[PDB]
Amino acid sequence: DKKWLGTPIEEMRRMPRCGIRLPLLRPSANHTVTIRVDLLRAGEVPKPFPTHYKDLWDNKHVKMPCSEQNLYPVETAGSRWELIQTALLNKFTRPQNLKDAILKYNVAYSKKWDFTALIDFWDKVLEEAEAQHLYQSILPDMVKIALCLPNICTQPIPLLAAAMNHSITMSQEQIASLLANAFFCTFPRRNAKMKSEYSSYPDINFNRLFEGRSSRKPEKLKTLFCYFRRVTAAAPTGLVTFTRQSLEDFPEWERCEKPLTRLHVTYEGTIEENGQGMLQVDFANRFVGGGVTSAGLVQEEIRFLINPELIISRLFTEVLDHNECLIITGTEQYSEYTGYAETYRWSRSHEDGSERDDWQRRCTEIVAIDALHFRRYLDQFVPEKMRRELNKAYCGFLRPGVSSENLSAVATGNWGCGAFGGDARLKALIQILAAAAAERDVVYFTFGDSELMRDIYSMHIFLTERKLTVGDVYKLLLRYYNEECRNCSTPDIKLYPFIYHAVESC
Numbered sequence: 001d002k003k004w005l006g007t008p009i010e011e012m013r014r015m016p017r018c019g020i021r022l023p024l025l026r027p028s029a030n031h032t033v034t035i036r037v038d039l040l041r042a043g044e045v046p047k048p049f050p051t052h053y054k055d056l057w058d059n060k061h062v063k064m065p066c067s068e069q070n071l072y073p074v075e076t077a078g079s080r081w082e083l084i085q086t087a088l089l090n091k092f093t094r095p096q097n098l099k100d101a102i103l104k105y106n107v108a109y110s111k112k113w114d115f116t117a118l119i120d121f122w123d124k125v126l127e128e129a130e131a132q133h134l135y136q137s138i139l140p141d142m143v144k145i146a147l148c149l150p151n152i153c154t155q156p157i158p159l160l161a162a163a164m165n166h167s168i169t170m171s172q173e174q175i176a177s178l179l180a181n182a183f184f185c186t187f188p189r190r191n192a193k194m195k196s197e198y199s200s201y202p203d204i205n206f207n208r209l210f211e212g213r214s215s216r217k218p219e220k221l222k223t224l225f226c227y228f229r230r231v232t233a234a235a236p237t238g239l240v241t242f243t244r245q246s247l248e249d250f251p252e253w254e255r256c257e258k259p260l261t262r263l264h265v266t267y268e269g270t271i272e273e274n275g276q277g278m279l280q281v282d283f284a285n286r287f288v289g290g291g292v293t294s295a296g297l298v299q300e301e302i303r304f305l306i307n308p309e310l311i312i313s314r315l316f317t318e319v320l321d322h323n324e325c326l327i328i329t330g331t332e333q334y335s336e337y338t339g340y341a342e343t344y345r346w347s348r349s350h351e352d353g354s355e356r357d358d359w360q361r362r363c364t365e366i367v368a369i370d371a372l373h374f375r376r377y378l379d380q381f382v383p384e385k386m387r388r389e390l391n392k393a394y395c396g397f398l399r400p401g402v403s404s405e406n407l408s409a410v411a412t413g414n415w416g417c418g419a420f421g422g423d424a425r426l427k428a429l430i431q432i433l434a435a436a437a438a439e440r441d442v443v444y445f446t447f448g449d450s451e452l453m454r455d456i457y458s459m460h461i462f463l464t465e466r467k468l469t470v471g472d473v474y475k476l477l478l479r480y481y482n483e484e485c486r487n488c489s490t491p492d493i494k495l496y497p498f499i500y501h502a503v504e505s506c
Protein backbone atom coordinates (compact mmCIF):
# COMPACT_ATOMS: atom_id res chain seq x y z
CA ASP A 1 0.00 0.00 0.00
CA LYS A 2 1.58 3.24 -1.40
CA LYS A 3 1.68 6.16 1.12
CA TRP A 4 0.99 8.79 -1.54
CA LEU A 5 -0.54 8.80 -5.01
CA GLY A 6 -0.49 11.08 -8.05
CA THR A 7 2.11 13.70 -9.05
CA PRO A 8 5.39 13.37 -7.02
CA ILE A 9 5.62 16.12 -4.42
CA GLU A 10 9.04 17.27 -5.85
CA GLU A 11 7.22 18.15 -9.14
CA MET A 12 4.82 20.52 -7.21
CA ARG A 13 5.51 24.34 -7.03
CA ARG A 14 6.97 25.72 -3.73
CA MET A 15 8.01 29.29 -2.57
CA PRO A 16 9.95 31.70 -2.51
CA ARG A 17 11.54 29.80 -5.49
CA CYS A 18 8.23 29.79 -7.51
CA GLY A 19 6.99 33.27 -6.53
CA ILE A 20 8.44 36.42 -8.21
CA ARG A 21 10.73 39.03 -6.52
CA LEU A 22 8.64 41.40 -4.41
CA PRO A 23 7.81 45.04 -5.27
CA LEU A 24 9.13 47.73 -2.88
CA LEU A 25 7.36 47.51 0.49
CA ARG A 26 5.49 50.76 1.00
CA PRO A 27 2.35 52.07 2.72
CA SER A 28 -0.62 52.96 0.50
CA ALA A 29 -4.42 53.34 0.80
CA ASN A 30 -4.78 49.49 0.91
CA HIS A 31 -1.56 48.69 2.80
CA THR A 32 -0.73 49.76 6.38
CA VAL A 33 3.06 49.42 7.08
CA THR A 34 3.97 50.01 10.77
CA ILE A 35 7.81 49.96 10.40
CA ARG A 36 10.55 52.06 8.75
CA VAL A 37 10.90 50.40 5.30
CA ASP A 38 14.07 52.45 4.45
CA LEU A 39 15.75 50.94 7.59
CA LEU A 40 14.53 47.34 7.16
CA ARG A 41 17.59 45.04 7.31
CA ALA A 42 18.11 41.29 7.67
CA GLY A 43 18.85 40.33 11.26
CA GLU A 44 18.02 43.81 12.65
CA VAL A 45 14.98 44.59 14.80
CA PRO A 46 12.67 46.84 12.62
CA LYS A 47 12.19 50.45 13.78
CA PRO A 48 8.56 51.54 14.34
CA PHE A 49 7.04 54.18 12.02
CA PRO A 50 6.12 56.85 13.23
CA THR A 51 8.88 57.47 15.83
CA HIS A 52 6.42 58.78 18.53
CA TYR A 53 3.08 57.16 19.54
CA LYS A 54 0.11 58.42 17.46
CA ASP A 55 -3.36 57.52 18.76
CA LEU A 56 -6.70 56.90 17.00
CA TRP A 57 -9.71 56.05 19.19
CA ASP A 58 -12.55 55.52 16.69
CA ASN A 59 -14.78 52.96 14.93
CA LYS A 60 -12.15 52.19 12.22
CA HIS A 61 -9.06 51.35 14.33
CA VAL A 62 -8.00 49.06 17.17
CA LYS A 63 -8.70 50.72 20.55
CA MET A 64 -5.26 50.58 22.14
CA PRO A 65 -4.88 50.01 25.92
CA CYS A 66 -2.25 52.81 26.03
CA SER A 67 -4.69 55.42 24.54
CA GLU A 68 -5.29 58.58 26.63
CA GLN A 69 -9.00 57.95 25.72
CA ASN A 70 -8.80 54.56 27.58
CA LEU A 71 -10.49 55.85 30.74
CA TYR A 72 -12.35 54.50 33.76
CA PRO A 73 -14.84 56.14 36.23
CA VAL A 74 -13.26 57.07 39.61
CA GLU A 75 -15.29 58.00 42.77
CA THR A 76 -13.61 61.98 37.56
CA ALA A 77 -12.14 59.88 34.70
CA GLY A 78 -8.96 57.97 35.50
CA SER A 79 -6.34 56.64 33.10
CA ARG A 80 -6.78 52.88 32.53
CA TRP A 81 -3.20 52.66 31.13
CA GLU A 82 -1.75 54.09 34.38
CA LEU A 83 -3.90 51.60 36.34
CA ILE A 84 -2.57 48.68 34.14
CA GLN A 85 1.07 49.81 34.72
CA THR A 86 0.48 50.01 38.51
CA ALA A 87 -1.27 46.59 38.60
CA LEU A 88 1.33 44.71 36.44
CA LEU A 89 4.50 46.23 38.05
CA ASN A 90 4.37 44.06 41.18
CA LYS A 91 6.23 40.89 41.92
CA PHE A 92 4.20 37.73 41.39
CA THR A 93 5.06 34.78 43.65
CA ARG A 94 1.68 32.98 43.66
CA PRO A 95 -1.07 32.54 40.97
CA GLN A 96 -3.53 34.66 43.01
CA ASN A 97 -1.18 37.68 42.55
CA LEU A 98 -1.51 37.41 38.78
CA LYS A 99 -5.32 36.96 38.98
CA ASP A 100 -5.60 40.03 41.29
CA ALA A 101 -3.35 42.17 39.00
CA ILE A 102 -5.46 41.33 35.88
CA LEU A 103 -8.73 42.06 37.73
CA LYS A 104 -7.56 45.54 38.97
CA TYR A 105 -8.34 46.95 35.52
CA ASN A 106 -11.14 44.43 34.85
CA VAL A 107 -13.31 45.04 38.00
CA ALA A 108 -16.65 44.35 36.13
CA TYR A 109 -15.49 40.71 35.47
CA SER A 110 -14.09 39.91 38.94
CA LYS A 111 -17.03 37.52 39.51
CA LYS A 112 -17.37 36.36 35.88
CA TRP A 113 -13.76 35.40 35.00
CA ASP A 114 -12.62 32.03 36.29
CA PHE A 115 -8.81 31.55 36.76
CA THR A 116 -8.89 27.83 37.80
CA ALA A 117 -6.74 26.64 34.83
CA LEU A 118 -4.12 29.31 35.47
CA ILE A 119 -3.99 28.50 39.22
CA ASP A 120 -3.86 24.73 38.49
CA PHE A 121 -1.16 25.16 35.80
CA TRP A 122 1.11 27.15 38.14
CA ASP A 123 0.41 25.18 41.36
CA LYS A 124 -0.60 21.65 40.24
CA VAL A 125 1.11 21.05 36.85
CA LEU A 126 4.51 22.81 37.00
CA GLU A 127 7.42 21.51 39.07
CA GLU A 128 8.83 24.02 41.66
CA ALA A 129 11.73 25.22 39.36
CA GLU A 130 9.40 25.69 36.35
CA ALA A 131 6.93 27.76 38.48
CA GLN A 132 9.91 29.80 39.78
CA HIS A 133 11.17 30.46 36.22
CA LEU A 134 7.60 31.48 35.19
CA TYR A 135 7.13 34.10 37.92
CA GLN A 136 10.75 35.25 38.30
CA SER A 137 11.63 35.48 34.59
CA ILE A 138 8.80 34.79 32.04
CA LEU A 139 5.91 36.84 33.59
CA PRO A 140 8.04 39.98 34.45
CA ASP A 141 9.57 39.86 30.87
CA MET A 142 6.00 39.62 29.46
CA VAL A 143 4.86 42.61 31.61
CA LYS A 144 7.82 44.69 30.35
CA ILE A 145 7.12 43.99 26.67
CA ALA A 146 3.33 44.60 27.23
CA LEU A 147 4.09 47.97 28.92
CA CYS A 148 6.46 48.97 26.04
CA LEU A 149 3.39 48.99 23.70
CA PRO A 150 3.32 52.83 23.07
CA ASN A 151 7.03 52.77 22.04
CA ILE A 152 6.66 49.65 19.86
CA CYS A 153 3.17 50.02 18.20
CA THR A 154 3.34 53.73 17.42
CA GLN A 155 0.99 53.63 14.39
CA PRO A 156 -2.80 53.16 14.63
CA ILE A 157 -3.85 49.67 13.48
CA PRO A 158 -6.86 49.72 11.12
CA LEU A 159 -9.56 47.14 11.52
CA LEU A 160 -9.78 44.72 8.60
CA ALA A 161 -13.57 45.21 8.41
CA ALA A 162 -16.09 43.30 6.26
CA ALA A 163 -15.69 43.95 2.48
CA MET A 164 -12.32 45.71 2.94
CA ASN A 165 -9.45 44.55 0.68
CA HIS A 166 -6.58 45.68 2.85
CA SER A 167 -3.22 44.55 4.19
CA ILE A 168 -1.33 45.24 7.43
CA THR A 169 2.44 44.58 7.60
CA MET A 170 3.92 44.81 11.10
CA SER A 171 6.97 43.44 12.90
CA GLN A 172 7.04 40.19 14.92
CA GLU A 173 8.33 42.38 17.85
CA GLN A 174 5.14 44.57 17.51
CA ILE A 175 3.04 41.36 17.51
CA ALA A 176 4.79 40.10 20.68
CA SER A 177 3.99 43.38 22.53
CA LEU A 178 0.35 43.12 21.42
CA LEU A 179 0.05 39.39 22.40
CA ALA A 180 1.56 40.12 25.89
CA ASN A 181 -1.24 42.74 26.26
CA ALA A 182 -3.91 40.13 25.13
CA PHE A 183 -2.43 37.67 27.75
CA PHE A 184 -2.81 40.34 30.48
CA CYS A 185 -6.38 41.07 29.12
CA THR A 186 -5.70 44.79 28.54
CA PHE A 187 -7.61 45.43 25.31
CA PRO A 188 -10.57 47.73 26.10
CA ARG A 189 -14.13 47.15 24.75
CA ARG A 190 -13.32 43.53 23.89
CA ASN A 191 -14.97 41.83 26.93
CA ALA A 192 -18.71 42.49 27.29
CA LYS A 193 -21.03 39.63 26.20
CA MET A 194 -23.61 42.34 25.20
CA LYS A 195 -21.10 44.62 23.34
CA SER A 196 -22.15 45.93 19.89
CA GLU A 197 -19.01 47.64 18.54
CA TYR A 198 -16.88 44.46 18.49
CA SER A 199 -19.74 41.87 18.49
CA SER A 200 -18.64 40.73 14.99
CA TYR A 201 -14.92 40.45 16.05
CA PRO A 202 -13.31 37.38 17.71
CA ASP A 203 -12.20 37.44 21.37
CA ILE A 204 -8.64 38.78 21.77
CA ASN A 205 -8.08 39.01 25.58
CA PHE A 206 -6.89 35.58 26.91
CA ASN A 207 -9.17 35.31 29.98
CA ARG A 208 -11.01 32.17 28.70
CA LEU A 209 -7.64 30.33 28.57
CA PHE A 210 -7.48 30.62 32.38
CA GLU A 211 -10.88 29.06 33.05
CA GLY A 212 -11.93 25.53 34.05
CA ARG A 213 -10.22 22.14 34.53
CA SER A 214 -9.77 20.74 30.99
CA SER A 215 -6.53 18.64 30.82
CA ARG A 216 -5.84 20.49 27.53
CA LYS A 217 -5.38 23.93 29.25
CA PRO A 218 -1.88 23.10 30.63
CA GLU A 219 -0.91 22.08 27.04
CA LYS A 220 -2.21 25.39 25.57
CA LEU A 221 -0.41 27.34 28.32
CA LYS A 222 2.90 25.45 27.79
CA THR A 223 2.64 26.19 24.08
CA LEU A 224 2.00 29.92 24.63
CA PHE A 225 4.64 30.35 27.40
CA CYS A 226 7.15 28.62 25.04
CA TYR A 227 6.45 31.45 22.56
CA PHE A 228 6.51 34.22 25.20
CA ARG A 229 9.78 32.91 26.66
CA ARG A 230 11.35 32.90 23.15
CA VAL A 231 10.23 36.39 22.08
CA THR A 232 11.06 38.17 25.40
CA ALA A 233 14.56 36.49 25.62
CA ALA A 234 15.48 37.50 22.01
CA ALA A 235 13.45 40.03 20.01
CA PRO A 236 12.32 38.48 16.69
CA THR A 237 13.47 40.46 13.62
CA GLY A 238 11.02 39.62 10.83
CA LEU A 239 7.73 41.03 9.51
CA VAL A 240 4.27 39.50 9.07
CA THR A 241 1.53 40.54 6.58
CA PHE A 242 -2.22 40.13 7.27
CA THR A 243 -4.43 40.56 4.18
CA ARG A 244 -8.17 40.56 4.12
CA GLN A 245 -9.37 39.51 0.61
CA SER A 246 -13.01 39.90 -0.61
CA LEU A 247 -14.01 38.92 -4.18
CA GLU A 248 -16.83 40.64 -6.07
CA ASP A 249 -16.80 38.37 -9.18
CA PHE A 250 -17.17 34.59 -8.86
CA PRO A 251 -16.98 32.12 -11.76
CA GLU A 252 -20.12 30.84 -13.47
CA TRP A 253 -19.00 27.32 -12.43
CA GLU A 254 -21.25 25.39 -14.89
CA ARG A 255 -19.56 27.32 -17.79
CA CYS A 256 -15.92 26.97 -16.59
CA GLU A 257 -13.79 25.44 -19.35
CA LYS A 258 -10.60 25.10 -17.26
CA PRO A 259 -9.19 21.56 -16.94
CA LEU A 260 -8.24 20.04 -13.55
CA THR A 261 -4.73 20.71 -12.28
CA ARG A 262 -2.21 18.24 -10.74
CA LEU A 263 -2.76 16.26 -7.52
CA HIS A 264 -0.50 14.77 -4.87
CA VAL A 265 -2.64 12.95 -2.25
CA THR A 266 -1.21 11.25 0.87
CA TYR A 267 -2.45 9.71 4.14
CA GLU A 268 0.88 10.61 5.93
CA GLY A 269 2.43 13.98 6.72
CA THR A 270 1.13 17.39 7.76
CA ILE A 271 0.40 20.71 6.05
CA GLU A 272 3.04 22.57 8.18
CA GLU A 273 5.93 20.07 7.67
CA ASN A 274 5.25 18.62 4.18
CA GLY A 275 3.57 21.74 2.76
CA GLN A 276 6.62 24.05 3.13
CA GLY A 277 6.69 26.81 0.51
CA MET A 278 3.07 26.06 -0.49
CA LEU A 279 -0.16 27.92 0.24
CA GLN A 280 -1.20 26.28 3.56
CA VAL A 281 -4.89 26.03 4.42
CA ASP A 282 -6.19 26.81 7.87
CA PHE A 283 -9.65 25.07 8.35
CA ALA A 284 -11.00 28.20 9.89
CA ASN A 285 -14.03 29.31 11.92
CA ARG A 286 -15.72 32.47 10.52
CA PHE A 287 -14.30 34.23 13.68
CA VAL A 288 -10.58 33.51 12.78
CA GLY A 289 -8.72 31.30 15.23
CA GLY A 290 -11.93 29.70 16.54
CA GLY A 291 -11.57 28.62 20.16
CA VAL A 292 -7.79 29.29 20.36
CA THR A 293 -8.14 31.71 23.36
CA SER A 294 -10.72 29.34 24.99
CA ALA A 295 -11.55 25.59 24.63
CA GLY A 296 -10.90 24.63 20.94
CA LEU A 297 -8.00 22.32 20.06
CA VAL A 298 -8.58 21.09 16.49
CA GLN A 299 -6.68 21.99 13.22
CA GLU A 300 -7.05 25.80 13.36
CA GLU A 301 -6.42 26.19 17.12
CA ILE A 302 -3.31 23.98 16.96
CA ARG A 303 -1.84 26.09 14.13
CA PHE A 304 -2.64 29.27 16.10
CA LEU A 305 -0.85 27.88 19.17
CA ILE A 306 2.34 26.69 17.37
CA ASN A 307 2.45 29.91 15.24
CA PRO A 308 1.14 32.41 17.89
CA GLU A 309 1.61 35.44 15.61
CA LEU A 310 -1.59 34.18 13.84
CA ILE A 311 -3.48 34.89 17.13
CA ILE A 312 -3.12 38.68 16.65
CA SER A 313 -5.34 38.47 13.54
CA ARG A 314 -8.18 38.29 16.18
CA LEU A 315 -7.43 41.86 17.27
CA PHE A 316 -8.32 43.40 13.93
CA THR A 317 -10.10 40.77 11.72
CA GLU A 318 -13.88 41.10 11.57
CA VAL A 319 -15.91 37.87 11.13
CA LEU A 320 -15.49 36.56 7.56
CA ASP A 321 -18.40 36.85 5.14
CA HIS A 322 -19.02 34.11 2.46
CA ASN A 323 -16.90 35.89 -0.19
CA GLU A 324 -13.90 36.61 2.12
CA CYS A 325 -10.68 35.08 3.41
CA LEU A 326 -7.62 36.09 5.48
CA ILE A 327 -4.10 35.49 4.11
CA ILE A 328 -1.21 35.57 6.60
CA THR A 329 2.39 35.66 5.42
CA GLY A 330 5.45 35.40 7.65
CA THR A 331 4.25 33.72 10.87
CA GLU A 332 7.00 31.68 12.56
CA GLN A 333 6.66 28.21 14.20
CA TYR A 334 7.83 28.33 17.85
CA SER A 335 6.58 24.93 19.10
CA GLU A 336 6.37 21.27 18.16
CA TYR A 337 3.42 19.16 19.35
CA THR A 338 1.97 15.61 19.28
CA GLY A 339 -1.65 14.48 19.15
CA TYR A 340 -4.80 16.38 18.28
CA ALA A 341 -7.89 17.57 20.19
CA GLU A 342 -8.07 15.65 23.52
CA THR A 343 -4.59 14.03 22.87
CA TYR A 344 -2.81 17.30 21.97
CA ARG A 345 0.46 17.82 23.87
CA TRP A 346 3.21 20.46 23.61
CA SER A 347 6.44 18.54 22.79
CA ARG A 348 9.32 21.03 22.71
CA SER A 349 10.51 24.37 21.34
CA HIS A 350 10.90 24.58 17.50
CA GLU A 351 13.70 26.57 15.74
CA ASP A 352 12.01 27.69 12.50
CA GLY A 353 14.38 27.13 9.56
CA SER A 354 12.16 28.85 6.93
CA GLU A 355 13.98 31.44 4.80
CA ARG A 356 12.76 35.06 4.72
CA ASP A 357 11.54 36.85 1.56
CA ASP A 358 12.61 40.44 0.53
CA TRP A 359 10.23 41.95 3.19
CA GLN A 360 11.91 39.91 5.99
CA ARG A 361 8.83 37.66 6.23
CA ARG A 362 9.24 33.92 6.86
CA CYS A 363 8.35 32.07 3.60
CA THR A 364 5.12 30.58 5.09
CA GLU A 365 1.75 31.62 3.62
CA ILE A 366 -1.40 30.51 5.43
CA VAL A 367 -4.96 31.13 4.23
CA ALA A 368 -7.96 31.00 6.63
CA ILE A 369 -11.11 29.69 4.80
CA ASP A 370 -14.16 28.77 6.87
CA ALA A 371 -16.26 25.78 5.80
CA LEU A 372 -20.04 25.76 6.48
CA HIS A 373 -21.54 23.87 9.42
CA PHE A 374 -24.18 21.41 8.17
CA ARG A 375 -27.10 20.73 10.60
CA ARG A 376 -28.10 17.78 8.32
CA TYR A 377 -25.76 15.71 6.10
CA LEU A 378 -27.83 16.24 2.89
CA ASP A 379 -27.78 20.08 3.23
CA GLN A 380 -24.25 20.30 1.72
CA PHE A 381 -25.42 18.90 -1.65
CA VAL A 382 -27.85 21.83 -2.15
CA PRO A 383 -26.41 23.77 -5.20
CA GLU A 384 -26.35 27.11 -3.29
CA LYS A 385 -24.30 25.40 -0.47
CA MET A 386 -21.93 23.76 -3.04
CA ARG A 387 -21.43 27.08 -4.92
CA ARG A 388 -20.78 28.75 -1.52
CA GLU A 389 -17.94 26.27 -0.66
CA LEU A 390 -16.44 26.55 -4.17
CA ASN A 391 -16.46 30.41 -3.96
CA LYS A 392 -14.95 30.36 -0.43
CA ALA A 393 -12.04 28.02 -1.46
CA TYR A 394 -11.63 29.98 -4.75
CA CYS A 395 -11.32 33.29 -2.86
CA GLY A 396 -8.65 31.71 -0.60
CA PHE A 397 -6.72 30.34 -3.62
CA LEU A 398 -6.97 33.23 -6.11
CA ARG A 399 -4.20 35.84 -6.19
CA PRO A 400 -5.50 38.57 -8.58
CA GLY A 401 -2.76 39.98 -10.82
CA VAL A 402 -0.35 37.02 -10.27
CA SER A 403 0.44 34.62 -13.20
CA SER A 404 -0.13 30.82 -12.82
CA GLU A 405 3.63 30.01 -13.20
CA ASN A 406 4.25 32.13 -10.06
CA LEU A 407 1.62 30.30 -7.94
CA SER A 408 2.67 27.60 -5.47
CA ALA A 409 0.56 24.41 -5.01
CA VAL A 410 -2.22 24.49 -2.32
CA ALA A 411 -1.44 22.28 0.73
CA THR A 412 -4.80 21.23 2.15
CA GLY A 413 -6.76 18.29 3.50
CA ASN A 414 -10.22 17.25 4.84
CA TRP A 415 -11.69 20.82 5.29
CA GLY A 416 -14.86 21.18 7.45
CA CYS A 417 -14.99 17.44 8.36
CA GLY A 418 -16.43 15.67 11.45
CA ALA A 419 -18.15 18.15 13.83
CA PHE A 420 -19.05 20.54 10.96
CA GLY A 421 -20.70 17.58 9.13
CA GLY A 422 -18.78 17.90 5.84
CA ASP A 423 -18.55 14.89 3.47
CA ALA A 424 -14.77 14.37 2.84
CA ARG A 425 -15.23 13.09 -0.77
CA LEU A 426 -17.37 16.09 -1.79
CA LYS A 427 -15.07 18.61 -0.05
CA ALA A 428 -12.04 17.12 -1.75
CA LEU A 429 -13.72 17.61 -5.19
CA ILE A 430 -14.80 21.19 -4.28
CA GLN A 431 -11.18 22.11 -3.33
CA ILE A 432 -9.85 20.42 -6.51
CA LEU A 433 -12.33 22.44 -8.65
CA ALA A 434 -11.52 25.74 -6.87
CA ALA A 435 -7.74 25.17 -7.18
CA ALA A 436 -8.27 24.36 -10.90
CA ALA A 437 -10.20 27.69 -11.43
CA ALA A 438 -7.43 29.56 -9.52
CA GLU A 439 -4.85 27.63 -11.74
CA ARG A 440 -2.98 25.95 -8.81
CA ASP A 441 -1.97 22.30 -8.20
CA VAL A 442 -3.21 20.49 -5.03
CA VAL A 443 -1.30 18.63 -2.29
CA TYR A 444 -4.00 16.85 -0.24
CA PHE A 445 -3.41 15.34 3.21
CA THR A 446 -5.91 12.71 4.42
CA PHE A 447 -4.47 12.45 7.99
CA GLY A 448 -4.28 8.62 8.27
CA ASP A 449 -7.28 7.80 6.06
CA SER A 450 -5.66 5.56 3.40
CA GLU A 451 -9.05 4.59 1.80
CA LEU A 452 -9.92 8.31 1.30
CA MET A 453 -6.46 8.89 -0.31
CA ARG A 454 -7.17 6.06 -2.87
CA ASP A 455 -10.76 7.33 -3.57
CA ILE A 456 -9.61 10.95 -4.20
CA TYR A 457 -6.73 9.74 -6.42
CA SER A 458 -8.99 7.40 -8.45
CA MET A 459 -11.65 10.10 -8.92
CA HIS A 460 -9.01 12.74 -9.95
CA ILE A 461 -7.25 10.35 -12.39
CA PHE A 462 -10.70 9.27 -13.84
CA LEU A 463 -11.83 12.89 -14.52
CA THR A 464 -8.41 14.06 -15.90
CA GLU A 465 -7.94 11.06 -18.28
CA ARG A 466 -11.46 11.81 -19.60
CA LYS A 467 -10.55 15.58 -20.04
CA LEU A 468 -13.54 16.73 -17.93
CA THR A 469 -13.51 20.50 -17.25
CA VAL A 470 -14.40 22.30 -13.95
CA GLY A 471 -17.81 23.00 -15.60
CA ASP A 472 -18.35 19.32 -16.57
CA VAL A 473 -17.57 18.20 -12.96
CA TYR A 474 -19.77 20.97 -11.45
CA LYS A 475 -22.73 19.81 -13.63
CA LEU A 476 -22.23 16.23 -12.30
CA LEU A 477 -22.55 17.62 -8.75
CA LEU A 478 -25.84 19.37 -9.79
CA ARG A 479 -27.11 16.06 -11.27
CA TYR A 480 -26.28 14.16 -8.00
CA TYR A 481 -28.34 16.67 -5.94
CA ASN A 482 -31.24 16.45 -8.39
CA GLU A 483 -31.29 12.64 -8.72
CA GLU A 484 -30.38 11.68 -5.12
CA CYS A 485 -30.85 14.64 -2.66
CA ARG A 486 -33.76 16.97 -3.70
CA ASN A 487 -36.46 14.21 -3.56
CA CYS A 488 -34.73 12.24 -0.71
CA SER A 489 -36.73 12.19 2.60
CA THR A 490 -34.61 9.66 4.64
CA PRO A 491 -28.78 9.01 0.10
CA ASP A 492 -29.23 5.65 -1.73
CA ILE A 493 -26.00 6.03 -3.78
CA LYS A 494 -22.75 7.77 -2.80
CA LEU A 495 -21.27 10.71 -4.82
CA TYR A 496 -18.18 9.04 -6.35
CA PRO A 497 -20.07 5.87 -7.53
CA PHE A 498 -22.74 8.27 -9.02
CA ILE A 499 -20.08 10.25 -10.96
CA TYR A 500 -18.37 7.05 -12.23
CA HIS A 501 -21.78 5.72 -13.44
CA ALA A 502 -22.90 9.09 -14.94
CA VAL A 503 -19.65 9.50 -16.94
CA GLU A 504 -19.19 5.78 -17.96
CA SER A 505 -22.83 5.38 -19.16
CA CYS A 506 -23.17 8.73 -21.06
Ligand SMILES: Cc1ncc(Cn2c(=O)c3cc(S(=O)(=O)NC4(C)CC4)ccc3n(C)c2=O)s1
Nearest residue numbers: 269270271272299302303340414417446447449
Ligand atom coordinates in the same frame (compact mmCIF):
# COMPACT_ATOMS: atom_id res chain seq x y z
C1 LIG B 1 -9.47 11.50 8.59
C2 LIG B 1 -9.39 12.84 9.22
N1 LIG B 1 -9.81 13.97 8.65
C3 LIG B 1 -9.59 15.03 9.52
C4 LIG B 1 -9.04 14.73 10.73
C5 LIG B 1 -8.69 15.69 11.84
N2 LIG B 1 -7.25 15.91 11.92
C6 LIG B 1 -6.71 16.99 11.21
O1 LIG B 1 -7.44 17.74 10.61
C7 LIG B 1 -5.24 17.10 11.27
C8 LIG B 1 -4.62 18.15 10.62
C9 LIG B 1 -3.22 18.24 10.66
S1 LIG B 1 -2.41 19.58 9.87
O2 LIG B 1 -1.43 19.06 8.97
O3 LIG B 1 -3.43 20.45 9.35
N3 LIG B 1 -1.55 20.33 11.00
C10 LIG B 1 -2.07 21.20 12.10
C11 LIG B 1 -2.89 20.45 13.14
C12 LIG B 1 -2.43 22.59 11.69
C13 LIG B 1 -1.20 22.34 12.51
C14 LIG B 1 -2.47 17.36 11.43
C15 LIG B 1 -3.09 16.31 12.05
C16 LIG B 1 -4.47 16.17 12.01
N4 LIG B 1 -5.13 15.12 12.67
C17 LIG B 1 -4.36 14.15 13.45
C18 LIG B 1 -6.50 14.95 12.63
O4 LIG B 1 -7.05 14.05 13.22
S2 LIG B 1 -8.77 13.03 10.82
